[PDB]
Amino acid sequence: IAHGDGRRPNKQRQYIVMKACNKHHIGAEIELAAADIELLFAEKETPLD
Amino acid sequence: IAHGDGRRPNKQRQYIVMKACNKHHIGAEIELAAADIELLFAEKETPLD
Numbered sequence: 001i002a003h004g005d006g007r008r009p010n011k012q013r014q015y016i017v018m019k020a021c022n023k024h025h026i027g028a029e030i031e032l033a034a035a036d037i038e039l040l041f042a043e044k045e046t047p048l049d
Numbered sequence: 050i051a052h053g054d055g056r057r058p059n060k061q062r063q064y065i066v067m068k069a070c071n072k073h074h075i076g077a078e079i080e081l082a083a084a085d086i087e088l089l090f091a092e093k094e095t096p097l098d
Contacts, residue, residue, distance in 0.1 A: 002077035011078045 003009065039049075051058070088098075 002075045004073050004075055009076045009078050011080045 042049075
């Protein structure tokens with residue numbers, strides 16, 4: 001604001017605010033039993049398999 | 050007001066009231082960078098300028 005008093009008319013100030021990026025990591029663990037992987041690729045022909 | 054008591058009458062009365070203008074002055078500074086002024090007036094002759 002331009003003022004009408006006797007003090008020093010202060011110049012504007014440009015601030016340079018320098019931010020960052022907070023990183024985060026999320027992970028969940030999933031077990032698969034070995035008797036489940038084994039009969040996934042196994043050849044099947046009977047109606048029970 | 051004309052009275053019926055009688056103290057003295059009242060003649061015609063006027064008033065002349067003086068007014069004036071208050072002046073004001075206003076200032077606000079604008080800084081310029083001396084490095085920013087220096088590159089302005091020369092001719093650009095490269096894709097960087």
